[PDB]
Amino acid sequence: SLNTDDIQGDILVGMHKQKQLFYFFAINDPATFKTHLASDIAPVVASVTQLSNVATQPLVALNIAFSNTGLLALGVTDNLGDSLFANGQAKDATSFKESTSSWVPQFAGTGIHGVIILASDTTDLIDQQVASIESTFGSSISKLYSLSASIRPGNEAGHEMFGFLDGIAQPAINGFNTPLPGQNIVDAGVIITGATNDPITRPSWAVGGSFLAFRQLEQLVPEFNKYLLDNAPAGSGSLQARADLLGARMVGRWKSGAPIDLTPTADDPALGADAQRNNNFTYSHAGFDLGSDQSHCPFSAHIRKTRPRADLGGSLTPPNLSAGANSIMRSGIPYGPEVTSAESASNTTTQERGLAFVAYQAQLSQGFHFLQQTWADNANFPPGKTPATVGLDPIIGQNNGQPRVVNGLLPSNSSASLSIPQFVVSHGGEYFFSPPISAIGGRLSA
Amino acid sequence: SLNTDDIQGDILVGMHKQKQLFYFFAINDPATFKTHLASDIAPVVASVTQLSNVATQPLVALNIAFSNTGLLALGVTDNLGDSLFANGQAKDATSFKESTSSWVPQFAGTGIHGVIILASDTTDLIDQQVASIESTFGSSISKLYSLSASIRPGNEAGHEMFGFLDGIAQPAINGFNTPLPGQNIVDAGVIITGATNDPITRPSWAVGGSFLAFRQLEQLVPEFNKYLLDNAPAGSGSLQARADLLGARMVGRWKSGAPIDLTPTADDPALGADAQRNNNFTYSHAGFDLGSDQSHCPFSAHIRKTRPRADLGGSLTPPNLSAGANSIMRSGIPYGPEVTSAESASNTTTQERGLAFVAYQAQLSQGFHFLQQTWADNANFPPGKTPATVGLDPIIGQNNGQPRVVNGLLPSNSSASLSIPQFVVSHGGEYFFSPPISAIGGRLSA
Numbered sequence A, B: 001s002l003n004t005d006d007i008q009g010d011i012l013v014g015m016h017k018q019k020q021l022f023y024f025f026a027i028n029d030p031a032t033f034k035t036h037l038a039s040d041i042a043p044v045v046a047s048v049t050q051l052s053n054v055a056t057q058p059l060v061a062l063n064i065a066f067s068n069t070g071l072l073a074l075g076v077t078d079n080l081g082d083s084l085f086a087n088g089q090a091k092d093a094t095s096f097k098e099s100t101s102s103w104v105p106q107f108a109g110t111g112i113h114g115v116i117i118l119a120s121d122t123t124d125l126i127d128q129q130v131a132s133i134e135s136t137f138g139s140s141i142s143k144l145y146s147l148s149a150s151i152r153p154g155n156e157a158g159h160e161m162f163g164f165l166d167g168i169a170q171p172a173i174n175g176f177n178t179p180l181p182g183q184n185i186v187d188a189g190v191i192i193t194g195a196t197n198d199p200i201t202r203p204s205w206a207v208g209g210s211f212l213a214f215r216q217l218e219q220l221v222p223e224f225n226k227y228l229l230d231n232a233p234a235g236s237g238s239l240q241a242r243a244d245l246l247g248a249r250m251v252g253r254w255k256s257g258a259p260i261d262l263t264p265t266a267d268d269p270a271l272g273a274d275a276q277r278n279n280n281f282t283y284s285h286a287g288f289d290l291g292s293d294q295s296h297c298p299f300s301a302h303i304r305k306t307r308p309r310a311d312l313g314g315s316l317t318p319p320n321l322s323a324g325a326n327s328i329m330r331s332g333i334p335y336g337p338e339v340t341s342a343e344s345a346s347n348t349t350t351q352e353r354g355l356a357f358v359a360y361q362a363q364l365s366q367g368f369h370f371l372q373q374t375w376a377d378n379a380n381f382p383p384g385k386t387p388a389t390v391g392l393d394p395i396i397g398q399n400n401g402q403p404r405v406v407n408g409l410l411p412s413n414s415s416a417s418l419s420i421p422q423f424v425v426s427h428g429g430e431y432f433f434s435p436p437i438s439a440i441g442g443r444l445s446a
């Protein structure tokens, strides 16, 4: 009995649209804002139920979430029970070993009172909806910043900007999702505040909400590509295939989405396209030593860093259920143009492109923030490996701008390290709370 | 005669696409810019020939034009024979009785070196093409400003923001256009620099170009609509019907495109859509006194102010050929979102919409500038009327921000004045030269 009628769509199902806009606003007139929040927004906020039926999917799907300062501006002083949310992402940046100096300037503070997520299959429709929202609210709000995002073109649809199939792996909410082979299975309360086994006491009105960690993460695609080529493990055959292999071993999947744990030496596109198979692994293999074998998947690969499965205990055969509480739901969408001829030929980025990163979780210290700082950025995670130093996550791992020392990537010697420049650059973001839909025309507009 | 392979398509035929972007740039590094102008831009500039064939429409249509300062940045010091162009449009603002205070800051100066016009059926395609251009030119080009424009949706396609069908009336170029009934017929040299009967000496490389007068004109649609309702002449017809009549008498056409001169009391949508009938008039009528009769069409109506036809003498029967030299080719396209419910409910604009106005002419002083100052803004034009005070063009007439005095609009009393707020607000623009295509990889790249 998850009340999915009351849970904003993006949290659990995604927006299921081709285009999205992230519209970051300030509140100038609380009393006026509340009237329109309740009269005009509340009724068109799309729920999990609504979005889960192609029939009830609106022309423009709308979610809305508030920052700590946004809640304060609405006179909402209740403790939501999350100190990271409360203090905002800017004050948290040092945890991830970046400086707000590279952030979108409007992220580098707490001026942003909220974000509106618009999703639609054309940008035209999105723009008409922005117009409609702005004229409705009038002077009661100001736009501080916005970021447009879309599913990438054609064959690359649902792939991110480095070209890897994305959205494969999510936590399955016990009692809501039908678990796929290999998929972790977790209490609703890991993602939904006040949900089953959420140990943190919430204001009653906040029950059915989630915390949104937003991140604007630029990707240097041409530079990535060239680095793969330059450091492709010796072997055969073609240089591109060995570059692809190395790419794969960095992420933990081929670009087709085939997990390398199941197919370590060559891509398998059909496997990648198969929901019944492509997540059905734990990192354990009979009979290799889990603590020492990186021949299937490096200890430092992105996905193994972010969901370590058998690395943290639990069943060696699918499905592993370890570290449930550290699950996140991901609704990230690529942003920016495709790589151009000029950028590709010069192996140099000129146009900002990347990932509009969106993670949902009931406890920020358990989810995005934990994954970034305690796992991905942690040279000694996961524990109990030989060699002991795993190095940083080659995708997202940060060290105050320094190139990242990453181990295990080279199939023929797992002691062989690489020094890897950042290919993902954080321009920061903010922590929001995505209230249940009843709070929008309810408590928050009170 | 007219080498249409060498004439940029928008000048004579328009871009024939749903979306346009006007990309205003500066040149930072002329040597490098030239390189890419020749190798990258010239080859993809869309000619009149290419655009006139349904099956050779480019995926993205590109035209390009330069300001005086842009030409200078390219080491082209030749006299194009146009003093208004040389000065730029900021210095001309006084002529139109408008303050630069309302101008896009980037237009109020001569820092803009040119404009790239992109046209496509989606904005996605334009966005990717912008990225391609910016990556190719690198730091040698800089974006100073841009305006996105679009054909209006559904049944308003081809209508401007006030809701009137547009693009019905253009000069027919002798030898190029087969004239329609009523259409003015002009020498090619009225539009194309150095073409037939262009009296002005041009640099040889400039033969086959045109002057592009760009204007960003905001339209206050809700305000316009309200003004019509509040000022509609008393009558037995419905309120909406009498409002529409007033609107049509302001424009000189009904929204369907029907010219009121031919149908003064009723819309006729069959007429509006028929290119054979919908321009076939002179303003003359047996036996009415051309000098005093405003029952068919007010002397002050927009199209009558901008093509006076028989008001400037010549044939009383179609086609009238007066004032050929004061003709402009029009490539304007609406911009901004559709009117929202909030704005409509309130009768108040909050979202900027209007017309991205593009006029082409071989002499700025005979075309746009002439039409704005000598005709539209002149309370005594057209001449020889009774009463003498025609008033201003209700659509575009300007009086230093003051309400415009407009006479003749009320069928029942041709002496009856209305004091009309601006419905259109100039946010300025610039005068550019669109060169022949040969010049783009020729002289301008040299």
Ligand code: HEM
Binding pocket: A160, A161, A162, A164, A165, A166, A167, A168, A169, A170, A217, A218, A219, A251, A253, A302, A303, A304, A306, A307, A328, A354, A355, A357, A368, A371, A372, A376, A395, A396, A424
């Ligand atoms: C631009 C930067 C990023 C890129 C290119 C990237 C790329 C990917 C790719 C290709 C996958 C595998 C596809 C899939 O399983 O659906 C993936 C999975 C994942 N990523 Fe990221 N990612 C990025 C940032 C992040 C961040 C910042 C986090 C959180 C700290 C994160 C957490 C995850 C998680 C949890 C998974 C799924 C792991 C699993 O279920 O096995 N990623 N990422």
Ligand code: HEM
Binding pocket: B160, B161, B162, B164, B165, B166, B167, B168, B169, B170, B217, B218, B219, B251, B253, B302, B303, B304, B306, B307, B328, B354, B355, B357, B368, B371, B372, B376, B395, B396, B424
């Ligand atoms: C946003 C402001 C404007 C609006 C809403 C507007 C509206 C219209 C409309 C509805 C028509 C009739 C369509 C047609 O005959 O093709 C028209 C025609 C025309 N307009 Fe405008 N107009 C605007 C600005 C201008 C300006 C600034 C000029 C020049 C100074 C201009 C010159 C013309 C001309 C020459 C015609 C054709 C008249 C004829 O050949 O009989 N317009 N306009």
Ligand SMILES: *[C@@H]1O[C@H](CO)[C@@H](O[C@@H]2O[C@H](CO)[C@@H](O[C@@H]3O[C@H](CO)[C@@H](O)[C@H](O)[C@@H]3O)[C@H](O)[C@H]2NC(C)=O)[C@H](O)[C@H]1NC(C)=O
Binding pocket: A181, A276, A277, A280, A317, A318
């Ligand atoms: C997910 O992956 C697991 C492997 O980790 C798959 O489990 C395995 O499924 C196969 C069926 O193809 C089982 O094979 C069978 O084994 C029995 C004896 O145990 C034998 O008599 C049969 O001839 C057959 O080979 C295998 O036992 C089983 N292993 C485990 C540990 O469960 C599972 O099928 C995968 N799921 C999907 C949807 O692919």
Ligand SMILES: *[C@@H]1O[C@H](CO)[C@@H](O[C@@H]2O[C@H](CO)[C@@H](O)[C@H](O)[C@H]2NC(C)=O)[C@H](O)[C@H]1NC(C)=O
Binding pocket: B181, B276, B277, B280, B317, B318
């Ligand atoms: C354009 O309008 C003119 C009227 O101004 C039409 O000319 C008239 O046509 C009718 C029918 O042939 C004749 O009876 C009149 O004698 C014509 N008048 C003149 C002065 O020629 C002309 O037919 C119209 N053209 C179109 C295509 O409808």
Ligand SMILES: *[C@@H]1O[C@H](CO)[C@@H](O)[C@H](O)[C@H]1NC(C)=O
Binding pocket: A226, A229, A230, A345, A346, A347
């Ligand atoms: C980019 O890198 C690849 C491989 O390193 C190479 O083939 C290509 O020539 C490089 N381009 C430039 C401009 O250096």
Ligand SMILES: *[C@@H]1O[C@H](CO)[C@@H](O)[C@H](O)[C@H]1NC(C)=O
Binding pocket: A413, A414, A415, A416, A417
């Ligand atoms: C593995 O790489 C390391 C470099 O860190 C090196 O010391 C060692 O010789 C390599 N192992 C083999 C078998 O070559």
Ligand SMILES: *[C@@H]1O[C@H](CO)[C@@H](O)[C@H](O)[C@H]1NC(C)=O
Binding pocket: B226, B229, B230, B345, B346, B347
């Ligand atoms: C808008 O104008 C119309 C016509 O004048 C009027 O009936 C209506 O009350 C106005 N709306 C508002 C909100 O003032």
Ligand SMILES: *[C@H]1O[C@H](CO)[C@@H](O)[C@H](O)[C@H]1NC(C)=O
Binding pocket: B413, B414, B415, B416, B417
């Ligand atoms: C209308 O014409 C002018 C408007 O000012 C006025 O002087 C005259 O008296 C009016 N005539 C009628 C019949 O209303």
Ligand SMILES: [K+]
Binding pocket: A081, A082, A083, A084, A085, A362, A363, A364, A365, A366
């Ligand atoms: K927390």
Ligand SMILES: [K+]
Binding pocket: B081, B082, B083, B084, B362, B363, B364, B365, B366
């Ligand atoms: K001139």
